[PDB]
Design an enzyme around this catalytic site. Structure first.
Site, mmCIF file in Angstrom:
data_model
loop_
_atom_site.group_PDB
_atom_site.id
_atom_site.type_symbol
_atom_site.label_atom_id
_atom_site.label_comp_id
_atom_site.label_asym_id
_atom_site.label_seq_id
_atom_site.Cartn_x
_atom_site.Cartn_y
_atom_site.Cartn_z
ATOM 1 N N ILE A 15 5.999 4.300 -30.686
ATOM 2 C CA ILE A 15 6.204 3.476 -29.668
ATOM 3 C C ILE A 15 7.924 3.255 -29.414
ATOM 4 C CG2 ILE A 15 3.808 2.442 -29.432
ATOM 5 C CD1 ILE A 15 4.956 -0.040 -30.927
ATOM 6 N N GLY A 16 8.636 3.324 -30.050
ATOM 7 C CA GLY A 16 10.209 3.290 -30.034
ATOM 8 C C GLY A 16 10.813 4.269 -30.878
ATOM 9 N N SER A 17 12.091 4.513 -30.728
ATOM 10 C CA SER A 17 12.961 5.283 -31.466
ATOM 11 C C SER A 17 14.373 4.980 -31.428
ATOM 12 C CB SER A 17 13.029 6.993 -30.897
ATOM 13 O OG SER A 17 13.397 6.947 -29.449
ATOM 14 N N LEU A 19 12.623 4.434 -36.213
ATOM 15 C CA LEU A 19 11.518 4.640 -35.229
ATOM 16 C C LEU A 19 10.698 3.220 -35.401
ATOM 17 C CD1 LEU A 19 10.681 8.313 -36.690
ATOM 18 C CD2 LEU A 19 11.531 7.873 -34.497
ATOM 19 N N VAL A 20 10.013 3.035 -34.274
ATOM 20 C CA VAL A 20 8.766 1.911 -34.182
ATOM 21 C C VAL A 20 7.757 2.582 -33.873
ATOM 22 C CG1 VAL A 20 8.325 -0.189 -33.191
ATOM 23 C CG2 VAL A 20 10.888 0.402 -33.630
ATOM 24 N N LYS A 34 8.621 -0.671 -38.309
ATOM 25 C CA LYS A 34 10.032 0.117 -38.203
ATOM 26 C C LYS A 34 10.474 0.765 -39.316
ATOM 27 C CE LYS A 34 14.668 -1.581 -36.680
ATOM 28 N NZ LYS A 34 15.565 -2.571 -36.552
ATOM 29 N N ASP A 125 24.544 -8.495 -32.192
ATOM 30 C CA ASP A 125 24.175 -7.428 -31.378
ATOM 31 C C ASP A 125 23.076 -7.876 -30.091
ATOM 32 O OD1 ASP A 125 24.209 -4.936 -30.221
ATOM 33 O OD2 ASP A 125 22.710 -4.220 -31.623
#
Ligand code: 477
EC number: 2.7.10.2
Length: 238
Positions: A15-17, A19-20, A34, A125
């Protein structure tokens, strides 16, 4: 601690990079797994980040179920946030937000940040990409156990990190929220003369005034997250 065996995790979809992945822990809880990026950051720092987060309990800070240590690539097992990262959510739902909802998102981030400020924890961040959206549009700050657009003058020139430098990043986050996920902005030197960030349409004069207070050249002139929280709450009431 909170060590999770790899056999307890079910990987469903990327679902994300690193990586998730959307997944399941013990074939029950929906989780965001993650996995570490082999190149960037050490395995030790990745785990230490999770150890710090597991001892910081606030309704506006992301929570972890545990860590998967056994085999490479190692992973952190987070609670699943239904609407993903704030930066993406603002852009996908652009034009559907009321100004009151956008202020509420800023209030959620500020609450979590006020807790971290009091615990003497510097994010370093803080950005809309590092915030998550849950059910009923609740915002939680993520990756708090560890650019130039989100960096304060003392950070991009002397690397002087403090809760007041996080305040500057929050001002940029506030811009991202009110502009509905717009990408902010040699970005350093541009800000040294006096270039801030254009006032977004949905942000009122009082909202942009708070953003400018976060953007004061001197860190001591910027308000603390504890003060910002009550200032943002005053605008929502009036
Ligand atoms: C936007 C909704 C969706 O596309 C559903 C699959 C999506 C996309 C990305 C994410 C990331 C998360 C997420 N939940 N909790 C965490 C912690 C993260 C970080 F600590 F690695 S990313 C994340 N939920 C998502 C949900």
């Amino acid at each position: 601690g909170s060590v999770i065996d790899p056999s307890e995790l079910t990987f469903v979809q990327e679902i994300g990079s690193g990586l998730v992945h959307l997944g399941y822990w013990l074939n029950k809880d929906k989780v965001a797994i993650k996995t570490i990026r082999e190149g960037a950051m050490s395995e030790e720092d990745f785990i230490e980040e999770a150890e710090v987060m597991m001892k910081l309990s606030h309704p506006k800070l992301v929570q972890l179920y545990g860590v998967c240590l056994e085999q490479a690539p190692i992973c952190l097992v987070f609670e699943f946030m239904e609407h993903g990262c704030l930066s993406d959510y603002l852009r996908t739902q652009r034009g559907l937000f009321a100004a009151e909802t956008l202020l509420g998102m800023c209030l959620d981030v500020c609450e979590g940040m006020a807790y971290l400020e009091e615990a003497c924890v510097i994010h370093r961040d803080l950005a809309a990409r590092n915030c998550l959206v849950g059910e009923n549009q609740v915002i939680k700050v993520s990756d708090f156990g560890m650019p130039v657009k989100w960096a304060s003058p003392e950070v991009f020139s002397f690397s002087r990190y403090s809760s007041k430098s996080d305040v500057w990043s929050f001002g940029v986050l506030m811009w991202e929220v009110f502009s509905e996920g717009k990408i902010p902005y040699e970005v350093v030197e541009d800000i040294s003369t006096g270039f801030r960030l254009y006032k977004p349409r949905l942000a009122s004069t009082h909202v942009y005034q708070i953003m400018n207070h976060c953007w004061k050249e001197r860190p001591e002139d910027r308000p603390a997250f504890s003060r910002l929280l009550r200032q943002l709450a005053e605008i929502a009431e009036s």
